[PDB]
Amino acid sequence: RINTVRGPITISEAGFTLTHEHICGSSAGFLRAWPEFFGSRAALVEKAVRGLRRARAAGVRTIVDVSTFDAGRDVSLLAEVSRAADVHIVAATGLWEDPPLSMRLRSVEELTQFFLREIQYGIEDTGIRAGIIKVATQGKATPFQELVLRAAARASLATGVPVTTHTQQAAIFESEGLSPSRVCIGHSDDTDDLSYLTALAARGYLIGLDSWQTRALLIKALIDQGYMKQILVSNDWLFGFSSYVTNINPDGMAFIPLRVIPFLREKGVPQETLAGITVTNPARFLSPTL
Ligand SMILES: [Zn+2]
């Protein structure tokens, strides 16, 4: 069973899953400070529900929202849009690029307990539990970033909930006893080299990407190398979405099933492989595994 914002779900209920999406983010809060310009909360919820119902109509069944407490996560909003659009949503714990003072001073043991609190107890006073750990990294490795990755690895070891991060790191995860099949390492264009992707893929890590046709061909290259079981999919292939710039692109959150899947079909990626990367791989990733 996977923790969603409306409660636990079985593996088989997850279906077609996007694994690194952005409903919540930095900018939604300013609707509280300035609704005259940005619109009401109800209008934001309405825009989000409409976009998710279109993604649902195109075939998306589950999305993983990777916003964290320090990057604008709003799990009560996620639960409302999940119910209205009939799309499962997995919430994340973790930390973003530049966390507050009060978090930058914590030990690995303390940060582990923070992540575990949001996985085992709930987020804030909502009772909604996170189903993934997101660790956003800036650039140059720093001791605090290594500390956060270690805390995430330990929370994953305790609960079996997967970790998703950005580009070394693999030695830290293995340092802590965590199987690579619990970790998705996301790569940007500056780290897109197919050689690096296959290297991490051969060691058991899941691979994410954060033009879109050239990203899709990188995916095909990875498949052609035999690594289809290590691939996760996300609307991030179109554009580097984040808490800075959320998913709410004339295809909206339906971009993957309406544009990328037909294109991969045109390039000859077979049906069983496409079902593997959109259904089997994310279900195996999200399913808590010790
Ligand atoms: Zn993303």
Numbering used by the authors: 36 to 202, 211 to 253, 276 to 313, 321 to 362
Give the text the authors published on this PDB structure.
The enzyme phospho­triesterase (PTE) is capable of hydrolyzing such OP compounds. Accordingly, it has been characterized from a number of bacterial sources, including Brevundimonas diminuta (Bd; formerly Pseudomonas diminuta), Flavobacterium spp. and Agrobacterium radiobacter. Carbon dioxide reacts with the side chain of Lys169 to form a carbamate functional group within the active site, which serves as a bridging ligand to the α-Zn2+ and β-Zn2+ ions, both of which are required for full catalytic activity. The buried α-Zn2+ ion is ligated to the protein via direct interactions with His55, His57 and Asp301, and the exposed β-Zn2+ ion interacts with His201 and His230.
However, A53_1 is a monomer, with only one Zn2+ ion in the active site. Since the presence of both Zn2+ ions and the correct orientation of the residues in the active site are crucial for maintaining the catalytic activity of PTE, it is reasonable to assume that the A53_1 monomer is catalytically inactive. A dimer is formed by applying the crystallographic twofold axis in space group P21212. However, this dimer interface utilizes different residues and is rather loose compared with the canonical non­crystallographic dimer seen in other PTEs, suggesting that it is not a physiological dimer. The two segments, residues 60–79 and 301–313, which are involved in the canonical PTE dimer interface show pronounced conformational differences in the A53_1 structure cartoon shown in Fig. 5. Since some of the residues in the disordered regions are in the vicinity of the active site, it is plausible that their disorder, and the significant conformational changes observed in residues 60–79 and 301–313, as well as the presence of only one Zn2+ ion, preclude the dimerization of the A53_1 structure and eliminate catalytic activity. Indeed, A53_1 occurs as a monomer in solution, as demonstrated by gel filtration (not shown).
